[PDB]
Amino acid sequence: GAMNSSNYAELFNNDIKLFVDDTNVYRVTVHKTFEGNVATKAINGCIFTLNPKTGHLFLKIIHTSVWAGQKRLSQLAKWKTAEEVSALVRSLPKEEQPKQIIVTRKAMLDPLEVHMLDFPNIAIRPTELRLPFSAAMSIDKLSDVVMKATEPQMVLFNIYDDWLDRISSYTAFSRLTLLLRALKTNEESAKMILLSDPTITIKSYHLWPSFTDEQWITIESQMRDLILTEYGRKYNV
């Protein structure tokens, strides 16, 4: 059934599962034409497919050429997502295939179910959580590889860097969702928080800075502050 606050620790059990977020698959800029009409220009996008237990991220880059000559692109984007997720599963060894796929938007349920008819034993599930994965393109290294791609490409990341060496996957996912919620609510401030101290660097093979345990507590507190603030600045409270 639907994933929510009640069955939240199920994410960190030992059944393989993937989140699929399609919010950055079809991306456009809207602009004026010489005649004063409006038109869109697509830019590169990505499917965000995440194992929340391990941090493994399958980032399928969606090159703008896939939209050439196509109609109803917002609908096609959902089916393209489902096609690519289905191809990913088929490419994995049987023992690495997920037992559940959780989509962050309910409009992905029918496209993914139809593409996965060959896999009747993989459950396709929605969620009532309002997860902040759209903010994945605020991670500088992820945005960079998407915008530089000249062709369709899959790039593998661990979105938790090395955190699992020191913390549980429950705690890692909570940190990730806090960082992404912050970046979604006020990207400039969030990014200032994460980089203010030039002595803390991002390793070449990492996405986030190399914070000590104590510095992560400070960071995490600054992100909570930011999120509550903006929630006042927004609702005047």
């Binding site: 096609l76 089916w79 029918d110 496209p111 139809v114 593409h115 008819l117 060959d118």
Partner: protein, 300 residues
């Protein structure tokens, strides 16, 4: 004209014959129904006055034998039976008619309703949906489940309607996932019409039979099949023009005959709003859209 005699009427019962019905009192001198039109299937159906639960009945075609009704006090229902002795049967009927103990099938001459509701319905196809090979007639009741309902529990007592499932490998060609799900013409024309039903007349016959079982017996399973078969056509961009014109006539007469007070449980707002206003065929069902909008504008 044909006759279905009754041995007796020992329990108070409402008796239906096609779209007609009448009340028989306990131990009333009722000995059956005469003047039944030859050339059509018919259904004779029953609701006991004490247990409105279980509507039940029998589909039959008088050209296929001499049939009569006899109450069984052990099984507690009116049963159809075949009389093989033709002279015994003619003798029985003639005496009951002479004593005027039969009701007349009360057809208005102008009235084509029953033809229009059963145009494509054939006894031979009914008997493949309702498997009871030793009888020439078919029993149906309110509680019988369909083969597809039993996949989601007695197989001999099921309605073996053709299974339609829009998220199934049969419906979806590998590599045409989006195309086939959003435009079901492949599934309608190749899988179902060419492959399974062979022609549109058999498709329409099952659709009409499903509707009639839903209406007369409150069979929910028949209702799901009826809605599924409409939706498969309406969700196909490519449908033969003659099929669409005929479907509009079929559905018009079904909506016309439906009891106004049963639309609450017999009509599915989703399928109808989709079919009439969003689907490929939203502009192809003029007669059906007009009666639906004047008779059931609430649903829409």
């Amino acid at each position: 004209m044909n006759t279905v005699p009754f041995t007796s009427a020992p329990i108070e019962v409402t008796i239906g014959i096609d779209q007609y019905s009448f009340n028989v009192k306990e131990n009333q001198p009722f000995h059956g129904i005469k003047d039944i039109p030859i050339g059509h299937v018919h259904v004779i159906h029953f609701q006991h006055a004490d247990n409105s639960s279980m509507r039940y009945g029998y589909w039959f075609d008088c050209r296929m034998g001499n049939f009569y009704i006899q109450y069984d006090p052990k099984d507690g229902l009116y049963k159809m039976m075949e009389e093989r002795d033709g002279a015994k049967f003619e003798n029985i009927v003639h005496n009951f008619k002479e004593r005027q103990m039969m009701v007349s099938y009360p057809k208005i001459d102008e009235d084509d309703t029953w033809y229009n509701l059963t145009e494509f319905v054939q006894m031979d196809k009914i008997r493949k949906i309702v498997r009871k090979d030793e009888n020439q007639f078919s029993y149906v009741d309110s509680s019988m489940t369909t083969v597809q309902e039993n996949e989601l529990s007695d197989p001999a007592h099921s309605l073996n309607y053709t299974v339609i499932n829009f998220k199934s490998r049969e419906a979806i060609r590998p590599g045409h996932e989006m195309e086939d799900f959003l435009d079901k013409s492949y599934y309608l024309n190749t899988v179902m019409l060419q492959g399974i039903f062979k022609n549109s007349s058999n498709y329409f016959g099952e659709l009409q039979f499903a509707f009639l079982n839903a209406m007369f017996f409150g069979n929910y399973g028949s209702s799901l099949q009826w809605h599924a078969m409409i939706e498969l056509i309406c969700s196909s961009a490519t449908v033969p023009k003659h099929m669409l014109d005929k479907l509009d006539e079929i559905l018009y007469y079904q909506i016309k005959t439906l009891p106004e007070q049963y639309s609450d449980i017999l009509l599915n707002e989703r399928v109808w709003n989709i079919c009439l206003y969003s689907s490929f065929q939203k502009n192809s069902l003029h007669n059906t859209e007009k009666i639906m909008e004047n008779k059931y504008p609430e649903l829409l």
